[PDB]
Ligand binder design. Structure first.
Ligand SMILES: Cc1ccncc1CC(=O)Nc1cccc2c1CNCC2
Ligand SMILES: Cc1ccncc1CC(=O)Nc1cccc2c1CNCC2
Lengths: 304, 304
């Protein structure tokens, strides 16, 4: 029992972190096989930041300008290419610690672990969700760029995020491992609107099921609702509309607890309309949306 | 910017996890050098649980009865001994992945990361605090016993906790790595009173400083207080009394922000007396006490 905001064990990812320096800029790279992936803004100086012409800046660089260091050893760079907002530095040595891996583009509302790094060294690990507006609320300081987000399925690490930028609002933006930004963001030092965010309804319901499984049941009520009625409430409270696909994904948790999804929706409806009245659920005084239904089942079943 | 409940990178600890089986019981062990540490209750059956005579149960066991498996390879057990509530299984092979390590007994109110494991395999990592009453609010299922808590200082892992038990209340109890329980707990299947818990005042103030550093400042007020006046409020709200040692530990955060510790105490006093009024601080609707002043500085400075 107990329910925590659990991250994946970061070991397989720690073995891939390297430091990449170009000119006077240092950030993190991800070394998989004989390629090191890092944000392309490593080639920028301070004057470039506002409106960089990455193609021109990269043309002034040669393989020997990209200093890649894996802990204490130096990697020899034999190729460089830009793919969207990432640089791919071909090195002459395959990473001996390369785990089984995939590059994936996650959907908004999905969760992943971040291994925050500075100078190629891991500092900490935390779990977060990709917001519906494609930002993440991380913990990143200057030098953390190139830190990655990932999920693990037994022995396979699916890398889904590489950190690039902190928006003026203090929220974070980045790319998939092919260098495509999540959201409308560009790698420029400029104010950039992040869309209106919403609460991930299916995740809140998953977390309410986790609460019931772990003994927090005070919020269960005598009511039910419909998808239409619940969605009128979700609209008013800036929650994502619930669909039958979301109900279907909540099926295993509904079966385990015996609480029909629409009955849990009626509990969530009452919590939205009345608040918590100074009470808590799983140690939180707000409705938590950073656990997917898959996360709840995994944590509640002890998947390793 | 941003502030997260960050765990240490778990890689150095993942390399030490093994599975220990004795009879029909399987749990986790920690393999450091040529010794495997695990909870002594691995030698119990279901009838033993209520009042085990561990000395007698251990006498019926021989080295070959303790099956230790590190991933896919079997370790040869050449010695066994019980030290308090832990068993130490001497093996013929030193763990090649043994990091630099220490065994430490942490103080209540201090924080650490837990690498939850099942069958010797890591499932997830999370950060928590040792409560003032010596329990931890973890996320542990049957089979997680032997999972450990730790802190990391550059390359040295200080192991501070080994998981043993879930109390009937759903909170967790365990030992230091010498097998001494934190708190009054015994490794028996019985109802055991956990003392009255309190909120870790110095940690809440550290987290309020983290909030100010990261932009959440609405709670700052025009007031100040004294240690005596603040402690009358801490008493009423079940908070640990603040001492000059706690004020001194908050010195670096007070210096960085320019907010005197007693002025932050007056902000905390107003939050205790009036609540949050439906507002949030660092994404929380309650006063968070699982970050020490050291954690706040480490996260805010990017220590790797
Ligand atoms: C300060 C910080 C904190 C947390 N996470 C990231 C950062 C740095 C950042 O946003 N860098 C950046 C992002 C887009 C483009 C460029 C840069 C840097 N100059 C080159 C052009
Ligand atoms: C079920 C669970 C969930 C989370 N964490 C731990 C557990 C198991 C547990 O409390 N075991 C235990 C703790 C003290 C003593 C003994 C045992 C087992 N039998 C032997 C004597």
């Amino acid at each position: 029992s107990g329910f925590r905001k659990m991250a994946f064990p970061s070991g397989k990812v720690e073995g891939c972190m390297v430091q990449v320096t170009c000119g006077t800029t240092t950030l993190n790279g991800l070394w998989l096989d004989d390629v090191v992936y890092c944000p392309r803004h490593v080639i920028c100086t301070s004057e470039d930041m506002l409106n960089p012409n990455y193609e021109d800046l990269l043309i002034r660089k040669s393989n020997h300008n990209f200093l890649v260091q894996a802990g204490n050893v130096q990697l020899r760079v034999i190729g460089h290419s830009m793919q969207n907002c990432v640089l791919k530095l071909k090195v002459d040595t395959a990473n001996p610690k390369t785990p089984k891996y995939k590059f994936v583009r996650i959907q908004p509302g999905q969760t992943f672990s971040v291994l925050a790094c500075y100078n190629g060294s891991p500092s900490g690990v935390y779990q977060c969700a990709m917001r519906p507006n494609f930002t993440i609320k991380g913990s990143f300081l200057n030098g953390s760029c190139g830190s990655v987000g990932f999920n693990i399925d037994y022995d396979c690490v699916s890398f889904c995020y590489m950190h690039h930028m902190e928006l003026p609002t203090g929220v974070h933006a980045g790319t998939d491992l092919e260098g495509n930004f999540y959201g409308p963001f560009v790698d420029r030092q400029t104010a950039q609107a992040a869309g209106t965010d919403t609460t991930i309804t299916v995740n809140v319901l998953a977390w309410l099921y986790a609460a019931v499984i772990n003994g927090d049941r005070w919020f269960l009520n005598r009511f039910t609702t419909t998808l239409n009625d619940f969605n009128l409430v979700a609209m008013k409270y800036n929650y994502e509309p619930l669909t039958q696909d979301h109900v279907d994904i909540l099926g295993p948790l509904s079966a385990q607890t015996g609480i029909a999804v629409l009955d849990m929706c009626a509990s969530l409806k009452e919590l939205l309309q009345n608040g918590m009245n100074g009470r808590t659920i799983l140690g939180s005084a707000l409705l938590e949306d950073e656990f997917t239904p898959f996360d709840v089942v995994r944590q509640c079943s002890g998947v390793t």
